[PDB]
Amino acid sequence: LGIDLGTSHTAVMSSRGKKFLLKSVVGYPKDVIGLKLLGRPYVVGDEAFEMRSYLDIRYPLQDGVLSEISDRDIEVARHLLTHVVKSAEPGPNDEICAVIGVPARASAANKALLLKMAQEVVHTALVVSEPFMVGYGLDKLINTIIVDIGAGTTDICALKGTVPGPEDQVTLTKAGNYVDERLQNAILERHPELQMNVNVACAVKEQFSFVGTPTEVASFEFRAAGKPVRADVTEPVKIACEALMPDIIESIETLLRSFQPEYQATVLQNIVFAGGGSRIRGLAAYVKEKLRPFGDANVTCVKDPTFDGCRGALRLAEELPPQYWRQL
Amino acid sequence: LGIDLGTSHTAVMSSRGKKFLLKSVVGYPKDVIGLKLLGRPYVVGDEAFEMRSYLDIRYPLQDGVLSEISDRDIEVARHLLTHVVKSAEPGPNDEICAVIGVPARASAANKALLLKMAQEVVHTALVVSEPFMVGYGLDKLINTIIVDIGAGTTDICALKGTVPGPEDQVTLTKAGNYVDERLQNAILERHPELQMNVNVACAVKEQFSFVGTPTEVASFEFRAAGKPVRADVTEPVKIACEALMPDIIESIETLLRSFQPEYQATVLQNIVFAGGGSRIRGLAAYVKEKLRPFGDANVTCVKDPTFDGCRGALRLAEELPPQYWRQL
Amino acid sequence: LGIDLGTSHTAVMSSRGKKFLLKSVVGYPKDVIGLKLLGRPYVVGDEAFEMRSYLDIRYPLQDGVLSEISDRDIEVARHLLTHVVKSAEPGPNDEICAVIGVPARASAANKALLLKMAQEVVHTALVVSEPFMVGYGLDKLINTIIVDIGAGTTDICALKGTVPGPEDQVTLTKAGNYVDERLQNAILERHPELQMNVNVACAVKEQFSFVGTPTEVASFEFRAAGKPVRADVTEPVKIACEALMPDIIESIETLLRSFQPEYQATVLQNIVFAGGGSRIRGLAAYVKEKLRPFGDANVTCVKDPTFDGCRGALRLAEELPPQYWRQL
Amino acid sequence: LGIDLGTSHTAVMSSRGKKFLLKSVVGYPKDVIGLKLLGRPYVVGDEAFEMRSYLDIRYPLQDGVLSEISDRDIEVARHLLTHVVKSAEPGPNDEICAVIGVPARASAANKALLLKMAQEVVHTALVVSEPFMVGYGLDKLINTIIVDIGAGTTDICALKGTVPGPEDQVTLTKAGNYVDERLQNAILERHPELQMNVNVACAVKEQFSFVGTPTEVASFEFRAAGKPVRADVTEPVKIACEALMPDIIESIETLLRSFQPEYQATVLQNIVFAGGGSRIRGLAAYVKEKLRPFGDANVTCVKDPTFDGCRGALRLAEELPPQYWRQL
Ligand SMILES: Nc1ncnc2c1ncn2[C@@H]1O[C@H](COP(=O)(O)OP(=O)(O)O)[C@@H](O)[C@H]1O
Ligand SMILES: Nc1ncnc2c1ncn2[C@@H]1O[C@H](COP(=O)(O)OP(=O)(O)O)[C@@H](O)[C@H]1O
Ligand SMILES: Nc1ncnc2c1ncn2[C@@H]1O[C@H](COP(=O)(O)OP(=O)(O)O)[C@@H](O)[C@H]1O
Ligand SMILES: Nc1ncnc2c1ncn2[C@@H]1O[C@H](COP(=O)(O)OP(=O)(O)O)[C@@H](O)[C@H]1O
Ligand SMILES: [Mg+2]
Numbered sequence A, B, C, D: 001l002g003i004d005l006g007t008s009h010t011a012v013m014s015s016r017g018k019k020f021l022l023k024s025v026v027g028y029p030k031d032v033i034g035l036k037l038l039g040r041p042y043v044v045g046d047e048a049f050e051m052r053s054y055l056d057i058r059y060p061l062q063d064g065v066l067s068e069i070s071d072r073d074i075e076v077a078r079h080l081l082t083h084v085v086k087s088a089e090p091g092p093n094d095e096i097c098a099v100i101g102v103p104a105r106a107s108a109a110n111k112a113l114l115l116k117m118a119q120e121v122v123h124t125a126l127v128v129s130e131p132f133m134v135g136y137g138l139d140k141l142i143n144t145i146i147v148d149i150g151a152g153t154t155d156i157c158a159l160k161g162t163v164p165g166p167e168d169q170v171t172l173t174k175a176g177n178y179v180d181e182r183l184q185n186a187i188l189e190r191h192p193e194l195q196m197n198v199n200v201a202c203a204v205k206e207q208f209s210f211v212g213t214p215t216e217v218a219s220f221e222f223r224a225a226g227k228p229v230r231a232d233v234t235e236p237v238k239i240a241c242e243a244l245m246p247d248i249i250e251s252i253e254t255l256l257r258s259f260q261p262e263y264q265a266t267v268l269q270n271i272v273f274a275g276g277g278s279r280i281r282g283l284a285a286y287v288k289e290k291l292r293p294f295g296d297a298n299v300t301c302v303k304d305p306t307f308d309g310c311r312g313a314l315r316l317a318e319e320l321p322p323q324y325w326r327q328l
């Protein structure tokens, strides 16, 4: 059971052979109101996004990584597993093991969290990081730089072929949520100084992801009063979003300098952008083109990362020689 | 010039020879109270704590050095410099160079910020990290794992014999602010469900820092309604703060595993704790005593870190051979 | 002036008659820390061994042979010479001549290097093979095969009747350093796979040199992690050290076969072992006893080679007239 | 079965009559990649050159001298045999005897290893030195010193008389590996002080072998930091290999002293140079020309030594009279 548990979607590819491309966020009814009819005993996935105004949303994966459960009872993770795993549970003992995607710098408490749940439910406790699944799934060679841009963290993975873990790699905290804070600051420098929330900032990032080049687009949107309506330009959206590139290429530069000549010379392994970064236009302009410029390596974007994360799930589904399971 | 940035203090050690015990927080007037340009054009220190309800508080440190400057025009930095540096400014044109403490994993954007400030004050921009600044004030031998427990980060950096700088260093995010979040989470799961804020969690941490041992103390504090007042037993304050110790000694263990036999055999040089951590009772119990226990090396607590930060400035005040200034 | 320059010690006896049993290894401070001037411009002796983690210690005697010195200024050897001059400074024209010990197969280029330095410090250059120097100090008869087992090389030299020079003498590269590599090979091919360096392997050899017989000893030492500690057996230390002697007596067999009939009948002339090999227990068992046995010649080990290196200096102080000086 | 076994490449002539110029170095997979002992039962030659970062490489012929295989099972040399010899094995018992090239000064321990391998392949163990292949294949008269300059050994052949095999000959291991050490030290004399590994040192030697004369060439490569690619000059490359020939002709001078009057009078037979050193420009300058000069003897170089190694193997293949094999 290879699951890419992330900040937006939850890509489930079982070993049995079924594909369930489910969604993120877990809530439960904020006050005492209604029975199951109104809400549900915890709400998981798309209905919690649809009812995000009626539920208390308890972070279950802070910064794209298993936290601990802030309710301090392990019920957000329990009802998460109820929705994802129990409702689609194999009825023939398809010898099921569990691989939950973790960020590149995962803690031992996140490993312990997965361990306790694997012992409770009944799954071999395996821990594989998100960019490892990509490097095992997509048939890439060493060294293929993997930049996974989600909402919570930004994983800069460029390990040697031993894949030692968090030794020669760094998980950055500046991600989509950091950009959303800068987008909130960007619209406070406008004339009417709108104060929109994070959900609105996410909508602008999703619909108008034109960061490398000044594509002439605008967000036709309403002001806080509700009657005024105008096309908000993306002049300060470009400025806000392009300020994270320096840190990405600085971490890449620092790592490449410390590697051997054959890992320095990879002007053909490219830099692979996955996640939400694959849907942002103009990220190849900085490295490949003449804009940052950052050397001259080519840049590759993953088409449909949600569908290509199940390839890594399939790769780890077989055969996983028990000897590897004891060693991981 | 040595500036020891911090939440508790922003200490200044001049070349002339004076110690200025200055304080944190920078705001500027959000309303129309007092005068802003003729009274307090930005407010720094204890007056900003005193008037924290009428000022717009735009952090500018975030547990470390230059954060980013949320004004986004060098206005938090400029009026901070006006308060601190221009008030201590030597009048005899003393060969002043700028040494400002940075976190163990400092960025190049922090260096860029230091450079922008160095152009404002025309001084040489020098970059010295805090763990080594402590080992300059307290000249201990190799190697004493200097751990700086502050409000923002927890910097764990062992020392190498040649003292090359922080090449192998750990900066954790779990710090005093993380403890305050856990303290809030603890009292939201109790009988009376206290509704205290972050500053109150910090206040109780400061007044009753008993974590290693169950010393029977109680915090005379107001209940969730606000008028009722009683001696509230600090039972779960010990529990909440206990859970950060594992990570501190895990990073040290990871270093010891990677160290060579010469560096492994250094338990007589002990581990030194500075910052707010050195004012917590029971910190030596885990490592020095027989409670975790963690090995054998003894524990030394820094008394009055403010003074020892000025010792590090004094060490770096002379002679700093221009050749060292070009090389740093 | 006789200098027995080794990897363990540097025995100095002046012409005047004073004994200075000085120490090995030359370093200098590796990164910018402290000041060599304040400490020592290059550090010579056990201070550099004790501070080998603070200093760059570039080998200045690869297997009893001076290196080319990549700095190309010969300042490792000039400060080494200075160290000895500080200990044994000449005053009233101390008829000082330089007796320098060399390995048995030293090249003319190696002698020319020593000659250049002897001309720099104005002294008569007298190149004497180390095995012959031992036979000058400990006056044995012909033919007493002298085997000098050091860290760098193993010098096997039958004493010649008139001692004409390098007629037939052998320098092997397998020595203490080779055995230390085999000790590393032992602990890396065992169950717990201990991770220890050469310095520690040398320490175990020094403290527990029990090779011919299975003396029941154990080395109380820390494991690869560094915290665990236990008494490690010397079963595979005996195996690792066993294979030195076979190669030594292989070369001696070649000498015995090459001897003329009057040199063949020399079983009462025996074989004398010096260096670090004189402090190994069970060495005489291989030859003298009935273990290999290598014939039945008796074995004599040199007691305190450090103290008996000055006896050869005294023998090569006097005499050596204007004909001996022109001859070398 | 005449096998020239080296560290760069091998040369095998079969009884059938085919030339196999196959490559050297043996590893086996250390990281998890493909199948370990099933994808390639130990990895030899060009796949180990291409995949050198995934393999554990354990040399078994340091400087033309068989080691002891530190795995302590002698499986690195046995799988090498199954790679080369078993893959080209006669299927009709083409009377096969094993002729493995040995250094001019081989030990009895090296012969013991040949005997261990001869039991694995069931063939007669024959011991013939490497430069005898050259002197018998390319029939030169007696006595024409042969200097075959390889990576590991530079066997100095001087056909002796009577006694038993090696009477007056010496293996010189001041060879490619020595030059690699000189090159690494010579590029540290540059301004930025390049710090390159052995593979790069070999690459520069192979591409621009200009030593005797100052031919102005340069190699576009990475500097010490390794950011720019610039035409790196060969000023200190000429210096690095300047002290090689002097030491070679030092040994030849010693041979000329040991030669009989008619053996000494062989300047019309010249000195024959082979191996990788035969493709270094300026080789005859030192001896034949007026640069050292070493007298005035003429110099002959072998064209394509790699292709002439099979001619020497063929010469030993036939007829190889059994009476000679019993006597060898
Ligand atoms: N078209 C788009 N342009 C920019 N960002 C997008 C787009 N679609 C989704 N995203 C962003 O992708 C982020 C989710 O991270 P992603 O890696 O795609 O999901 P997961 O973490 O589940 O694998 C969200 O911040 C979301 O706004
Ligand atoms: N007696 C005390 N017990 C516990 N913590 C204290 C005490 N006094 C001060 N502190 C804490 O020390 C912290 C300040 O440490 P400091 O090194 O200035 O932080 P930073 O350098 O990250 O800004 C604050 O969180 C403060 O509450
Ligand atoms: N008690 C001991 N047992 C075994 N070896 C020892 C002992 N004491 C010293 N040695 C070894 O003696 C060696 C020193 O030999 P030395 O003559 O100084 O070397 P070199 O001749 O190469 O200069 C070192 O390898 C050291 O470990
Ligand atoms: N054109 C060249 N110039 C100089 N050296 C070369 C050249 N080509 C190969 N070599 C060197 O020849 C050496 C190997 O020669 P070889 O006779 O195969 O030695 P071995 O038998 O010890 O492997 C290597 O060091 C290689 O770099
Ligand atoms: Mg993800």
Ligand SMILES: [Mg+2]
Binding pocket: B005, B006, B130, B148, B150, B275
């Ligand atoms: Mg601090």
Ligand SMILES: [Mg+2]
Binding pocket: C005, C006, C130, C148, C150, C275
């Ligand atoms: Mg010696």
Ligand SMILES: [Mg+2]
Binding pocket: D005, D006, D130, D150, D153
């Ligand atoms: Mg060869």
